[PDB]
């Protein structure tokens, strides 16, 4: 009997968060998923589930759970949803059209922005084609934007594919950093490893 609580603290309150292009996965398994800690939060900017009601999370069993987390701008959080397009959905982190899981975000201006600007968080600006759902690209190959081949040297129509967010505490809300957690729920032909308390 799985009896130890799923370590949601280690996900939501991780001391470090990934750049979106290099998004972090934690596997959650062989644990009781108590969501009441998340239910009692007022500061999340969004908390939506797809394929299950948020009201039923404490009653459901899954074969596998993944927690994907990263930082993006406020007005890019709408892209972390099935059927979205934009730099983030297309080139950084793509959810499937039939996604089963929840997307939670919160403003992290107090932690992730600095007086000089925080340039540590990166996003992929260019890619030859869109990510498949749950695909991850950490390559730093020079992007050929034009006719001429680039020979892995930067210049005219030959761009380094990653760009920095540069988060300043004085940015408008849409340009402030937001932390995101995506909980993926799998229901495969396998034993359940994650259940709610009930």
């Amino acid at each position, epitope marked *: 009997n799985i009896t130890n609580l799923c370590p949601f603290g280690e996900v939501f309150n991780a001391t470090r968060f990934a750049s979106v292009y290099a998004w972090n996965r934690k596997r959650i398994s062989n644990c009781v998923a108590d969501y009441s800690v*998340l*239910y009692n939060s007022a500061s*999340f*900017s*969004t*908390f*939506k*589930c*797809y394929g299950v*009601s*948020p*009201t*039923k999370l404490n009653d459901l069993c899954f074969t596998n759970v993944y927690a994907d987390s990263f930082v993006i701008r406020g007005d890019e959080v*709408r892209q972390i*949803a*099935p*059927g979205q397009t934009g730099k983030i959905a297309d080139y950084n982190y793509k959810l499937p059209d039939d996604f089963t899981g929840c*997307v939670i975000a919160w403003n992290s201006n107090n932690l992730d922005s600095k007086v000089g600007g925080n340039y540590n968080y990166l996003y992929r600006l260019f890619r030859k084609s869109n990510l498949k759902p749950f695909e991850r690209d950490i390559s730093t190959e020079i992007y050929q934007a034009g006719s001429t081949p680039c020979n892995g040297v930067e210049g005219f129509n030959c761009y380094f594919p990653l760009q920095s967010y540069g988060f300043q505490p004085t940015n408008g809300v849409g340009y402030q950093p937001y932390r995101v957690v995506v909980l993926s729920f799998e229901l495969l032909h396998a034993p359940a490893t994650v259940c709610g308390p009930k």
Partner: nanobody, 125 residues
Framework: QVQLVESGGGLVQAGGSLRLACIAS????????MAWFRQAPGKEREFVAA????????YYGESVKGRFTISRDNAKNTVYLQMNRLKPEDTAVYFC??????????????????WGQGTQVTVSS
């Protein structure tokens, strides 16, 4: 892009009934949580009701609980709001809304991507 058009609004006497309807574009209506909000003059958009994909969690604002019923007909891309025992305080613009996601914070306007232009309901006393 999903478009939404409300109908069935207008003038009605206190204690009367109205069925608002809202029809959506698109071939994946079943994938949308559908909702009703309303806005009285001087007030912000107030949550009225929402219905999940299966119909099976429904949600209601405190002041309409018992009087209003939300329902959906996936075959017709339509969500309905049955409004019974209407009071003057129910007078407002009623907005249809839709989102792929069901929100823990289901009363927040920002949790719904798609909005109709709204239709006036007026309840005389």
């Amino acid at each position: 892009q999903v478009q939404l058009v409300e109908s069935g609004g207008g003038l009605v006497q206190a204690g009367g009934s109205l069925r608002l309807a809202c029809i959506a574009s698109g071939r994946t209506f079943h994938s949308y949580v559908m909702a009703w909000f309303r806005q009285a003059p001087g007030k912000e958009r107030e949550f009225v009701a929402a219905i999940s994909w299966s119909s099976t969690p429904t949600y209601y604002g405190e002041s309409v609980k018992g009087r209003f019923t939300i329902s959906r007909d996936n075959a017709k891309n339509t969500v309905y709001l049955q409004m019974n025992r209407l009071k003057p305080e129910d007078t407002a613009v009623y907005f249809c809304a839709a989102d792929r996601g069901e929100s823990y914070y289901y009363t927040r306007p920002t949790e719904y991507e798609f909005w109709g232009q709204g239709t006036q309901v007026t309840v005389s006393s």
